[PDB]
Amino acid sequence: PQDLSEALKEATKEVHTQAENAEFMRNFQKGQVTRDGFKLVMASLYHIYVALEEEIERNKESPVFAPVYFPEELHRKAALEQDLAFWYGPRWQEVIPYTPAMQRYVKRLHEVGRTEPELLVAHAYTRYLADLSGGQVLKKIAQKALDLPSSGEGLAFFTFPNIASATKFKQLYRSRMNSLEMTPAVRQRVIEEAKTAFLLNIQLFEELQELLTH
C-alpha cells in the first residue's frame, strides 16, 4: 500500500501466519506452556531487547530512525531484568541461557544497527507491535497456566507502564513510521527486513520447541 505501516502489514501477512503456526507459539496459544518454556522465552526476549535497544540508542538521532525513537514509552530492558530476577533468581545473569537461535537474532540486530540503520525500523516495528498487540493476551494465558505465587513479579514485561493506550500509541507509531523518508529501494528492503525479523522469531520458536522436547 501507500503508507509504510499499511505496506508492512500486508507484506508480512504470510510470515505472521507461519509465526502463529510455529509449534511453540501454537502450544502457547493453546494455553499450553510450562515454567521452563516460559523461562526460555523470557531469556530470549532479554537478549533480543538488549541488542535492539543498544542499536536504537546508537541511531536515535539519525533521520532514518529518530521519528520512532520512544525511549520512555518503549524501553523494556529494565522490565525484563526485573522478570528474570524472579524467574532465575538473584544470580539470573549468570545462569540465563543464550542459545544459537538467540545469537542469530542478536547478530542481525547488530548488523542492521551498525551497517544498515535504514532497516532498524523494520525490527522495531516487528518486535514492539508484536509485544504490544499480543502482550496482554500471553500475560493472561501465562498467569493461568503458570499458577505463580502472589509474589507480584515475573510478568512486568507484558505491561508498558508509559503507554496509557495501546490502540492510541500504535496509531502514533504508525504515523511516525509513515513520516520516515525513504526511496522505493529502501522502502522495499524495509519490507523484506520485516520478513527476516519474523523468520528469526520463527527460527527461535523452532529451537526452543526442540530444546523443551527432550
Ligand code: HEM
Ligand atoms: C499464535 C500467535 C499469534 C497470534 C494469535 C497473533 C495475532 C495477531 C493479531 C490478532 C494481530 C492484530 C491485527 C489487527 O487487528 O490489526 C496481530 C498483530 C501483529 N502481530 Fe501477531 N500474532 C501472533 C504471533 C506474532 C508473532 C510471533 C509476531 C512476531 C514475532 C507477531 C507480530 C505482529 C505484528 C508486528 C503485528 C502488527 C501488525 C500491524 O498492524 O502492522 N505476531 N497479531
